[PDB]
Amino acid sequence: HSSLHPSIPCPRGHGAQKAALVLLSACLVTLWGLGEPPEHTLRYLVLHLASLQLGLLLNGVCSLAEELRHIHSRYRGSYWRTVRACLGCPLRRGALLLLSIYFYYSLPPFTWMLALLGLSQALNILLGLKGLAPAEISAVCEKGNFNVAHGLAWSYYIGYLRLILPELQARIRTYNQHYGAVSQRLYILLPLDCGVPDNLSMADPNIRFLDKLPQQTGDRAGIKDRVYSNSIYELLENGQRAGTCVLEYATPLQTLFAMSQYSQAGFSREDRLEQAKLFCRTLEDILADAPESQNNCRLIAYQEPSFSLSQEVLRHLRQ
Amino acid sequence: HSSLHPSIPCPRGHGAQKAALVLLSACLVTLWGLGEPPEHTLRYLVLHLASLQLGLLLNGVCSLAEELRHIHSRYRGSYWRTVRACLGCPLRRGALLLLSIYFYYSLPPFTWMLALLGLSQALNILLGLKGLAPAEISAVCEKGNFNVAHGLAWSYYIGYLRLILPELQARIRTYNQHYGAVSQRLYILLPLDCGVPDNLSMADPNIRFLDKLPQQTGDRAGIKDRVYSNSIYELLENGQRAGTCVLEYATPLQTLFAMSQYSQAGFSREDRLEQAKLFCRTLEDILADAPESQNNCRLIAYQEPSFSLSQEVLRHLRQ
Amino acid sequence: HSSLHPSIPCPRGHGAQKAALVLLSACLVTLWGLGEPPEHTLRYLVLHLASLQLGLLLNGVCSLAEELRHIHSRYRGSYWRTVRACLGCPLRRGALLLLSIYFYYSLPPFTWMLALLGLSQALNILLGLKGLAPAEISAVCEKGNFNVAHGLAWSYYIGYLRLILPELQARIRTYNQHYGAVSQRLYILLPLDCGVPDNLSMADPNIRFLDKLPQQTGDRAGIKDRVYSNSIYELLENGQRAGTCVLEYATPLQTLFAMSQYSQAGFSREDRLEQAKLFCRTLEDILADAPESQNNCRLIAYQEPSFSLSQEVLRHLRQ
Amino acid sequence: HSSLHPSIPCPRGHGAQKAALVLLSACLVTLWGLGEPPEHTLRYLVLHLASLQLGLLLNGVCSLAEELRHIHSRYRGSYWRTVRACLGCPLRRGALLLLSIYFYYSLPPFTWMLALLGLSQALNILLGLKGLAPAEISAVCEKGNFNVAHGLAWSYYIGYLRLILPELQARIRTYNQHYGAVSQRLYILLPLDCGVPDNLSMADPNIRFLDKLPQQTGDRAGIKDRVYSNSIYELLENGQRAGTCVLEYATPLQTLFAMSQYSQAGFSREDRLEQAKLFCRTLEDILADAPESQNNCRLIAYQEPSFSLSQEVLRHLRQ
Ligand SMILES: Nc1nc(=O)c2ncn([C@@H]3O[C@@H]4COP(=O)(O)O[C@H]5[C@@H](O)[C@H](n6cnc7c(N)ncnc76)O[C@@H]5COP(=O)(O)O[C@@H]3[C@@H]4O)c2[nH]1
Ligand SMILES: Nc1nc(=O)c2ncn([C@@H]3O[C@@H]4COP(=O)(O)O[C@H]5[C@@H](O)[C@H](n6cnc7c(N)ncnc76)O[C@@H]5COP(=O)(O)O[C@@H]3[C@@H]4O)c2[nH]1
Ligand SMILES: COc1cc(C(=O)O)ccc1NCc1ccc(C2(C(C)(C)C)OCC(C)(C)CO2)cc1
Ligand SMILES: COc1cc(C(=O)O)ccc1NCc1ccc(C2(C(C)(C)C)OCC(C)(C)CO2)cc1
């Protein structure tokens, strides 16, 4: 579980297998209750599996007819690789295909069934009735790491955090020696609504500015002397400076909000919220596992519902 | 067909429908040739479609028994939302289920078949069978914009290009008047190999640095005075200068490479190449559709072979 | 039972044999209670063992059809070597096969059963099934010293300890006479978490540096004058010095951690913890059996919890 | 394939599946020829698979009786985790087992067969006849990355090479500016026989010494100012200095050799050769993929059979 916000979803578990197992148990109980010859049950089961295998093969060939079109580009110009990418491991599929043909043409017409199955598959493809409901798509995307969040979070870590966090204590110490009473941790805010305002004081008058840390330099992607700066914002409580930190927004949230605004992104508000949660979780995990985040960064996430950003930041601070 | 670099893959086409159509035509011809009553054909076809609908329903029931765990977080507590997410369209799926059961019991036991289908689906779930082939999952993710690259490219546009392209002409003009004359285009390199060395001179000593453009500042996500810079690189040729332009590496390529290197990311080298290529395509498209791209920047794409970066960039400069 | 740290696992025992024995006893009792002619029992038992031998033979034939590709490289071209590597002991396995077939045909078709066994073994191989469970593979690898740690620990002994422990007393004596008196033992830290920060003071400011021991040189793997050094660390306590000793981090832990981080290694965090623990055990064993360990060095092991490294190392120093 | 040495084995392929497939085809053809009721063929095949599942459970419980002894240490004190690691995914295995019981007790005595299988498994465990032939063990260890080589190579990279390679060119340039005509690549030697001599000139009088590079420093594992030096050997051809390089031996080879010499390692000479090849291959792969090894080292491997190390090094050099 993530302590950042109760609203963060935990990774998908194995409850699906539990449900499948209980369903299978009840199902066998019902088969036993009916009392039909279990051999006939088994035969019909294996026949159904064979039919499903044939259907999968036909869907595969349908996709293959077009995956060939990209052979030179997407599949590095190798027909065998295209077949692998389309029908799965060719050896396993071929073996199952052969076994299915044997157990159909053998057990108690094969050509007629093949025709009917092909017709059904073609109908499924043409009508597009075949497809995955949102739950399956989301599960595959999370398990396969296909979510834009994943990418944005890994960028926010590798590109920026991995270079600033190690030097953060040094920069803070130098600034304090040269001059207030700042803490020694970058406080990054994650507005789950992706309502990032450019002017930080715009969010709350209590959030004001004190000074800017010395610009940190470094070569990056050929733009040498690229500089990553920071802003030491001061927490104005009861009209008083309760505390000064290095408060920050996670830039990728702005990116998500914008691509939600635009059209070509093909990205919707519910997706904005979903990817925001996923980004928060992934970044949390990365920082927790990585060493460079040794009490140098604190992640704050707040659900806009009234609301007092300054008080929440102060709460996380005094803790 | 893409134009950036020949290996870039064009978007998937509607060919699969054509393949299914030709398959349907051949299947109908052979079914007619077989010579059996069409009433039996329709009967078996509708029964088989009912079987698929029941299987999908049971798969949805299992996925729901899973997702109800996260209902509170991923679905705001609205049960109907989870049901929609799992079963598909509740109204359409329910209507199809009702029609299926009606026709089966009407058309020439029943609970036995339902049990057998449930058992088959349970085996499929338990033994980890319902896994889409790489091609199909690729198509789905691309269609739904579920790509690691997509987010990175959209950030790059919204977060660097959209903010540097406009003032780029002003910065170039100021440098030219202050001072050998750089070109009026920002040249971005898109190494498919994703090497992205830190300093240009390392990759090709024929490329040399000259000066920096005027630093551009601005307020961005809490930090104000966030200053974006550049680095004019002198393009030598056989020991002589033959052009000057603002050269660049697409940092998201650095992100992709580092992601590939690391392990927690769960990312693969094949995925690295594929995602980088998709990034190039998406950046090209968005830039072409971006009004700020008034020929202010040129995207350079190349793959490792022998190969001289300086010669290729000069060749592109000749235009 | 290990003594370094309570969580360290002792080597696997023969408990599996005891479980097999009790199971055999119970099975024989129940078989006797069932009350059938022992001749049938022996017939079916030997038939089943023959079936297993045939299955193992066929699996070996397939593995041979694979390994003959590498015969030239991994086996020096000696066909008999490959046959031994695949089928097991050629003489013993051949004799068991001959006895099996003789009894099989003798005892109350044949080729049909052989083909069925071949079908079973085929499916097992193709579908991807004959995979050992994690516990069994762990036992096998530990028994055969197929462990990532094993090599690292053996290097650490042969390559640092065996070459520093002897002259360590001389170096300590020289430093003491030159100049607060360090102890006569090398204290090696074994962080199971594998954090291994570069500088001790980072982990615990209570630990401070005092001076370095005399550098030891030597000829090693081409590089002569290869010099191994140390770093005496002052052990403070509540702002006061209470001991000095040559603190040390077991470097191979750095290798394990970085391996876990990287992806090309194909290494997992669970494997990281397991291998680090095995490394501690193996280092303890080798060191105890090493004559050079005349109480010249103490192995310190600890796990993250709150926890103070300085306090624990001092507690060990009290001995 | 590895260009280092023809003797290096390539990674194990998929030929095993090819052999399994052809075996399956032959078995099906034989079944068709004998022409037994294919229904009976199935019945017996599925029953055999059920028997295999029962046997696997028995072996698993036998292993569990041992593993439970280590629950607190090697399995983080969770019975469920122990069962998972001993019997595989409990859900899947349990479901297959339940289906097996239903199909046995249903299809054409269950208790008698269970007793017979239990006796067979107990006999297999007690007699130790159950086991993996060398080919399977090697394949699993290599696929699972359990080979000592793997660890030693990853150490040799992360600990040492990753720190010396980036600064190598700088050190060479500084040395040349201060003073011969060395190249810019650290040449590593991999004696496949693990015959590493401490005195490099001992291998060949032609291999003599010129000077030592400036000692490179750096903090490592608390031993700050740890120094990694180098030796600039000079190639003496025809009594003349043909070339000067940074030739060096791969230290882990010494570790492998010595750990072969000792007894507690439980390691044999053929294993020395095997792990030497594996180490060379893994190191080659890692350096090829990593960026830091950008034409900064050249791996040399030579099979001692007469032999002229100097000529081989010169050949690799002038190339
Ligand atoms: N708080 C904060 N202070 C900084 O100085 C800073 N600099 C970058 N970032 C953010 O962290 C990440 C690191 O940039 P990345 O390399 O992955 O891609 C960056 C990078 O390729 C490019 N870019 C941004 N700033 C610069 C810059 N100064 N110079 C060159 N390129 C830049 O535009 C991409 C997207 O930037 P943002 O997505 O809007 O926020 C960045 C980014 O999320 C910063 N965040
Ligand atoms: N060519 C060369 N020049 C060097 O300076 C050097 N220093 C280490 N190595 C080798 O690279 C690898 C890095 O050592 P690692 O840190 O992983 O464990 C090292 C490390 O824990 C310890 N050790 C060796 N040298 C030192 C040293 N100077 N200071 C502290 N510890 C050392 O002993 C372990 C094994 O050493 P070797 O297994 O014989 O060769 C090492 C090793 O193969 C070197 N190789
Ligand atoms: C991971 O294992 C699997 C992978 C895949 C896949 O690649 O989609 C499919 C199936 C896999 N195992 C399940 C399975 C069950 C039954 C059969 C079988 C018998 C072997 C008993 C007769 O009956 C049905 C059949 C017509 C298919 C032929 O074989 C085979 C397999
Ligand atoms: C990857 O899937 C597998 C995993 C494992 C494992 O984890 O050991 C074993 C086997 C797996 N697939 C192969 C398989 C074959 C046959 C059966 C089946 C039928 C489903 C048709 C009847 O036959 C009889 C049965 C009692 C064997 C179970 O049901 C199921 C599966």
Side-chain angles (χ1 to χ4, degrees):
Chain A
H1 213 308
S2 178
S3 76
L4 275 56
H5 201 299
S7 179
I8 301 299
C10 299
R12 253 183 268 284
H14 284 350
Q17 283 75 15
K18 267 273 287 184
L21 176 83
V22 64
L23 188 153
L24 185 58
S25 185
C27 197
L28 277 296
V29 175
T30 61
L31 277 296
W32 180 32
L34 266 287
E36 69 277 16
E39 186 280 330
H40 281 296
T41 300
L42 195 164
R43 186 150 67 84
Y44 275 52
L45 170 61
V46 58
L47 274 295
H48 178 201
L49 272 297
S51 88
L52 197 46
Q53 285 280 314
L54 292 171
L56 190 151
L57 186 153
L58 276 300
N59 180 41
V61 75
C62 295
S63 291
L64 202 173
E66 292 66 353
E67 289 310 311
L68 301 183
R69 187 185 301 265
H70 303 186
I71 190 167
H72 290 269
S73 179
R74 211 199 301 284
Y75 292 163
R76 293 179 293 173
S78 178
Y79 321 104
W80 198 90
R81 189 174 290 278
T82 71
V83 166
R84 153 180 290 262
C86 187
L87 283 67
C89 197
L91 278 295
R92 196 165 45 197
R93 192 63 48 188
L96 287 172
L97 161 53
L98 211 53
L99 196 62
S100 64
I101 297 169
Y102 178 96
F103 278 66
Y104 197 96
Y105 194 10
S106 65
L107 281 293
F110 164 60
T111 178
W112 163 280
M113 186 276 288
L114 171 149
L116 183 63
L117 265 289
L119 199 162
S120 87
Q121 274 309 337
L123 200 84
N124 264 347
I125 301 299
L126 281 190
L127 261 173
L129 207 56
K130 180 67 174 66
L132 287 172
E136 293 83 3
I137 292 177
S138 183
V140 169
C141 276
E142 301 216 30
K143 193 140 55 60
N145 290 318
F146 292 114
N147 290 318
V148 301
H150 195 273
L152 297 195
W154 268 106
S155 191
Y156 192 71
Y157 171 86
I158 297 169
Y160 167 80
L161 294 174
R162 200 185 59 182
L163 301 174
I164 304 320
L165 275 295
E167 307 293 20
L168 186 46
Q169 293 180 356
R171 287 157 82 253
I172 301 299
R173 184 131 41 69
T174 300
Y175 173 76
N176 261 347
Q177 188 274 331
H178 152 87
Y179 182 76
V182 297
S183 192
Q184 62 281 18
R185 281 208 202 69
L186 182 63
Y187 289 85
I188 297 169
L189 309 183
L190 305 161
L192 293 183
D193 63 25
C194 295
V196 171
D198 207 335
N199 180 4
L200 174 47
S201 307
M202 201 46 158
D204 183 358
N206 290 306
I207 301 299
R208 283 209 287 92
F209 172 84
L210 193 141
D211 189 76
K212 152 170 53 52
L213 272 159
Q215 63 81 25
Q216 188 269 332
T217 187
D219 206 4
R220 277 300 312 283
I223 305 311
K224 67 209 177 188
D225 291 331
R226 174 158 171 180
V227 305
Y228 306 106
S229 69
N230 291 108
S231 298
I232 307 99
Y233 283 81
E234 68 91 10
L235 277 296
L236 185 67
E237 180 48 56
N238 83 7
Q240 186 272 325
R241 186 176 63 74
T244 67
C245 56
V246 192
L247 188 153
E248 182 65 26
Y249 291 166
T251 306
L253 279 291
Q254 296 219 272
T255 300
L256 286 187
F257 171 93
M259 51 165 280
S260 55
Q261 293 297 116
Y262 283 50
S263 72
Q264 291 79 14
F267 183 76
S268 66
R269 304 191 300 71
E270 57 275 18
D271 312 328
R272 193 204 317 141
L273 180 161
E274 185 95 338
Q275 303 313 279
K277 262 142 180 183
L278 199 59
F279 172 101
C280 285
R281 192 188 68 187
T282 291
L283 185 145
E284 191 266 10
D285 273 348
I286 297 169
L287 294 174
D289 291 331
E292 293 82 3
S293 179
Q294 63 261 40
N295 290 318
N296 298 108
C297 169
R298 285 288 149 63
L299 271 289
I300 309 306
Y302 53 88
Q303 179 80 44
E304 182 64 25
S306 76
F307 186 87
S308 63
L309 160 58
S310 43
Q311 306 317 311
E312 285 151 64
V313 175
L314 291 156
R315 173 262 299 262
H316 295 285
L317 177 135
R318 58 175 44 88
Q319 189 277 332
Chain B
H1 182 74
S2 170
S3 69
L4 261 173
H5 162 86
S7 315
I8 298 294
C10 61
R12 294 213 167 80
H14 283 307
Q17 319 285 331
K18 313 201 310 213
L21 187 153
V22 61
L23 188 153
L24 175 54
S25 72
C27 177
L28 261 176
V29 175
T30 191
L31 193 45
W32 181 260
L34 260 65
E36 290 74 6
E39 52 269 41
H40 269 163
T41 293
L42 277 296
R43 170 187 296 169
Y44 285 113
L45 197 162
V46 65
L47 294 174
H48 169 258
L49 280 179
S51 64
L52 278 71
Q53 290 301 332
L54 273 295
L56 267 291
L57 175 80
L58 273 55
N59 192 352
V61 183
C62 295
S63 283
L64 187 153
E66 195 283 331
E67 301 275 330
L68 282 176
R69 190 73 61 74
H70 312 177
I71 180 172
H72 262 277
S73 172
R74 188 174 283 118
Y75 296 122
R76 315 169 299 200
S78 45
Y79 282 64
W80 195 94
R81 191 60 57 191
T82 69
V83 181
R84 164 175 189 111
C86 284
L87 273 46
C89 169
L91 310 180
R92 164 160 64 184
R93 185 49 39 77
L96 294 205
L97 182 63
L98 165 60
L99 184 60
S100 82
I101 181 156
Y102 175 97
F103 263 61
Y104 188 90
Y105 176 32
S106 178
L107 277 80
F110 173 60
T111 305
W112 181 64
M113 172 195 58
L114 181 155
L116 172 143
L117 276 296
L119 182 142
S120 165
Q121 213 54 40
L123 294 174
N124 267 347
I125 301 299
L126 278 155
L127 283 72
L129 278 292
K130 274 312 321 173
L132 277 298
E136 191 46 289
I137 188 64
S138 169
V140 175
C141 65
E142 181 295 337
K143 212 177 275 183
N145 290 318
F146 299 102
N147 296 115
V148 176
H150 180 97
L152 309 166
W154 263 102
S155 172
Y156 203 50
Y157 177 69
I158 298 154
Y160 189 90
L161 275 299
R162 198 192 57 188
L163 278 65
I164 301 299
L165 285 194
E167 281 86 310
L168 183 63
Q169 282 310 308
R171 296 147 52 90
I172 297 169
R173 287 257 173 70
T174 299
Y175 185 92
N176 266 355
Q177 303 334 304
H178 189 194
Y179 268 89
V182 300
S183 176
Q184 291 72 236
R185 285 209 187 152
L186 171 45
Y187 294 68
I188 297 169
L189 299 194
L190 293 199
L192 277 296
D193 186 74
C194 302
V196 56
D198 291 331
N199 70 305
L200 277 296
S201 71
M202 187 66 204
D204 205 347
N206 194 237
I207 299 314
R208 185 167 294 131
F209 170 85
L210 208 59
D211 284 27
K212 298 178 183 180
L213 285 175
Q215 297 203 337
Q216 164 155 12
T217 77
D219 189 358
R220 281 302 317 285
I223 307 188
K224 59 215 167 181
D225 173 275
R226 254 282 290 273
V227 65
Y228 309 91
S229 163
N230 299 104
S231 288
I232 301 100
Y233 280 94
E234 190 182 7
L235 291 93
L236 319 164
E237 173 154 40
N238 193 358
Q240 183 173 1
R241 183 199 297 214
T244 58
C245 63
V246 185
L247 211 53
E248 270 294 10
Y249 291 168
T251 313
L253 301 193
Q254 202 167 120
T255 311
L256 292 177
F257 180 87
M259 164 191 320
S260 51
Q261 199 69 9
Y262 277 35
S263 174
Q264 184 303 330
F267 192 76
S268 171
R269 297 189 60 265
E270 319 298 359
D271 290 341
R272 181 184 78 188
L273 196 45
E274 171 46 1
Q275 291 296 273
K277 292 177 71 68
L278 182 61
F279 177 99
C280 308
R281 163 149 75 71
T282 300
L283 194 47
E284 201 285 348
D285 172 328
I286 184 166
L287 193 71
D289 273 8
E292 278 84 318
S293 172
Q294 295 114 342
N295 297 115
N296 309 57
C297 84
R298 277 291 310 292
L299 301 203
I300 297 283
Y302 70 80
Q303 188 172 7
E304 295 286 28
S306 181
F307 156 79
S308 285
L309 183 63
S310 83
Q311 302 315 305
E312 162 152 40
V313 62
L314 285 169
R315 171 259 298 281
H316 282 244
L317 266 175
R318 293 286 104 72
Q319 313 328 317
Chain C
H1 182 74
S2 171
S3 68
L4 294 174
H5 163 86
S7 314
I8 299 286
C10 64
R12 292 212 168 79
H14 304 284
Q17 318 278 331
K18 306 193 325 201
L21 187 153
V22 74
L23 188 153
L24 174 54
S25 71
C27 176
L28 261 176
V29 175
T30 191
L31 193 45
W32 181 260
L34 259 66
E36 289 72 6
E39 51 268 41
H40 268 165
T41 293
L42 277 296
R43 167 186 297 170
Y44 285 112
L45 197 162
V46 65
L47 265 181
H48 169 258
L49 279 178
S51 65
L52 278 71
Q53 290 301 331
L54 270 296
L56 266 291
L57 175 79
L58 272 58
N59 191 351
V61 184
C62 295
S63 283
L64 187 153
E66 193 281 332
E67 301 266 329
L68 282 176
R69 191 74 61 74
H70 312 177
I71 182 171
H72 262 277
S73 173
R74 190 175 283 117
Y75 295 116
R76 315 169 298 200
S78 45
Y79 283 65
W80 195 94
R81 191 60 57 191
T82 67
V83 181
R84 164 175 190 111
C86 287
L87 272 46
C89 169
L91 310 180
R92 164 160 64 183
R93 185 49 39 77
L96 294 205
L97 182 63
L98 165 60
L99 182 61
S100 296
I101 182 157
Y102 175 96
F103 266 60
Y104 197 89
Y105 174 30
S106 158
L107 277 81
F110 174 56
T111 313
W112 183 65
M113 295 296 173
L114 179 149
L116 181 142
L117 274 296
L119 191 75
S120 166
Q121 217 56 37
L123 294 174
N124 264 354
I125 291 187
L126 294 174
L127 282 72
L129 277 290
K130 174 33 52 173
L132 280 294
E136 190 45 289
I137 188 74
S138 169
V140 175
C141 65
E142 182 295 329
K143 211 177 275 184
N145 290 318
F146 299 87
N147 290 318
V148 176
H150 183 98
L152 309 166
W154 263 103
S155 171
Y156 203 50
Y157 176 68
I158 297 156
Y160 191 86
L161 274 299
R162 198 193 58 188
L163 277 66
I164 301 299
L165 288 192
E167 281 96 311
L168 183 63
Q169 281 309 309
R171 295 146 53 90
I172 297 169
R173 286 258 173 70
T174 299
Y175 186 92
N176 267 355
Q177 302 335 304
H178 187 193
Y179 298 169
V182 300
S183 176
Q184 290 73 236
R185 285 209 187 152
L186 180 42
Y187 294 68
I188 297 169
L189 300 195
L190 292 201
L192 311 193
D193 186 74
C194 302
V196 55
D198 266 18
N199 69 305
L200 281 293
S201 72
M202 187 66 204
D204 205 347
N206 194 237
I207 307 304
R208 185 167 295 130
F209 168 83
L210 183 63
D211 204 18
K212 312 188 228 177
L213 283 176
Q215 298 202 338
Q216 163 155 12
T217 78
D219 189 358
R220 283 302 318 283
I223 318 181
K224 60 215 166 181
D225 186 74
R226 170 90 176 290
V227 66
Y228 308 94
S229 163
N230 297 108
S231 287
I232 301 99
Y233 279 93
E234 189 183 7
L235 291 93
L236 320 164
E237 173 154 40
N238 193 357
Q240 194 263 8
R241 182 200 295 215
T244 57
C245 63
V246 183
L247 261 183
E248 182 65 26
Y249 263 123
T251 309
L253 303 201
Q254 260 186 31
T255 291
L256 290 180
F257 181 87
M259 185 180 288
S260 45
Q261 275 290 63
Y262 278 36
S263 174
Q264 282 264 339
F267 191 76
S268 171
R269 299 188 60 265
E270 311 305 358
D271 294 337
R272 180 184 78 188
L273 195 45
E274 171 46 1
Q275 291 296 273
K277 292 177 71 68
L278 181 63
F279 177 99
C280 308
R281 171 153 70 74
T282 300
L283 195 46
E284 201 295 337
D285 186 74
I286 184 166
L287 193 71
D289 273 8
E292 179 49 33
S293 171
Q294 296 114 342
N295 296 115
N296 309 57
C297 85
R298 277 291 310 292
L299 301 203
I300 295 282
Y302 70 79
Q303 189 171 7
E304 294 289 28
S306 181
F307 156 79
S308 285
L309 183 63
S310 83
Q311 301 316 305
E312 161 153 30
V313 62
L314 285 169
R315 171 259 298 281
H316 282 244
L317 267 175
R318 293 286 104 72
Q319 313 330 317
Chain D
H1 189 275
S2 172
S3 77
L4 263 55
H5 200 299
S7 185
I8 301 299
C10 298
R12 252 183 267 284
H14 283 352
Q17 283 74 15
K18 266 273 280 173
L21 178 65
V22 65
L23 187 152
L24 194 78
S25 192
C27 295
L28 277 296
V29 175
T30 287
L31 275 296
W32 179 32
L34 273 288
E36 281 64 0
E39 187 278 329
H40 283 74
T41 300
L42 189 155
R43 201 159 67 86
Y44 291 121
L45 174 64
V46 64
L47 202 63
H48 180 198
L49 274 297
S51 176
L52 183 63
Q53 299 316 296
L54 293 173
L56 189 153
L57 183 151
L58 277 296
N59 177 40
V61 75
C62 295
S63 292
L64 178 157
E66 161 56 350
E67 292 304 290
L68 261 65
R69 190 180 303 265
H70 303 187
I71 190 167
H72 290 269
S73 179
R74 212 203 306 284
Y75 293 78
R76 293 179 292 173
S78 178
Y79 321 104
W80 197 96
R81 189 175 290 279
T82 61
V83 165
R84 185 211 204 293
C86 185
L87 281 70
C89 191
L91 277 295
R92 162 153 74 171
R93 172 63 37 60
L96 292 175
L97 169 151
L98 195 168
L99 189 59
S100 65
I101 297 169
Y102 181 90
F103 277 26
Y104 193 108
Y105 194 11
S106 63
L107 274 283
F110 166 58
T111 178
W112 164 279
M113 202 73 199
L114 171 148
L116 183 63
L117 273 296
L119 199 161
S120 63
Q121 286 300 108
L123 183 63
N124 275 330
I125 301 299
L126 281 191
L127 261 173
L129 212 61
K130 180 67 174 66
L132 284 180
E136 293 83 3
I137 288 177
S138 182
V140 162
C141 295
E142 183 178 1
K143 194 142 51 73
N145 290 318
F146 291 111
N147 290 138
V148 301
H150 194 274
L152 296 195
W154 269 100
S155 192
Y156 189 72
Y157 170 85
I158 297 169
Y160 167 78
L161 294 174
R162 200 186 58 181
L163 301 175
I164 305 319
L165 294 156
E167 313 291 32
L168 186 46
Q169 63 84 30
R171 288 157 83 253
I172 301 299
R173 292 153 46 62
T174 300
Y175 170 68
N176 288 319
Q177 188 274 331
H178 152 86
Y179 182 76
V182 300
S183 192
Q184 294 82 17
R185 281 198 202 69
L186 180 160
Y187 291 84
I188 297 169
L189 298 194
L190 305 166
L192 292 186
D193 61 21
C194 295
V196 175
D198 208 14
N199 179 1
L200 176 46
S201 307
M202 200 51 158
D204 183 358
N206 290 306
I207 301 299
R208 283 209 287 92
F209 167 92
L210 192 140
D211 184 34
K212 67 184 289 184
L213 273 166
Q215 59 87 29
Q216 191 254 12
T217 188
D219 203 4
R220 275 299 312 282
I223 303 304
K224 55 180 187 254
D225 291 331
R226 174 158 172 179
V227 308
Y228 306 105
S229 70
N230 282 110
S231 301
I232 307 101
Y233 281 73
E234 69 92 10
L235 277 296
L236 186 67
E237 180 48 57
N238 83 7
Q240 186 272 325
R241 185 175 62 72
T244 68
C245 53
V246 191
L247 187 153
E248 183 178 1
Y249 269 59
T251 307
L253 279 291
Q254 290 189 3
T255 300
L256 286 187
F257 172 93
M259 171 214 78
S260 55
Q261 293 297 115
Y262 283 42
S263 72
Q264 292 71 358
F267 183 76
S268 67
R269 314 181 301 81
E270 59 275 17
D271 313 323
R272 197 204 313 138
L273 181 163
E274 186 95 339
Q275 303 313 279
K277 263 142 190 173
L278 199 57
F279 174 100
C280 301
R281 192 189 68 187
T282 293
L283 187 144
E284 185 269 8
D285 272 338
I286 176 160
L287 294 174
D289 291 331
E292 293 82 3
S293 179
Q294 72 264 20
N295 290 318
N296 294 106
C297 64
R298 289 301 156 72
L299 273 296
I300 308 307
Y302 52 89
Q303 180 79 44
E304 182 64 24
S306 76
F307 186 87
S308 63
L309 160 58
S310 65
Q311 306 317 310
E312 285 151 64
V313 174
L314 291 156
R315 173 262 299 262
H316 295 285
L317 172 47
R318 58 175 44 88
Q319 189 277 332

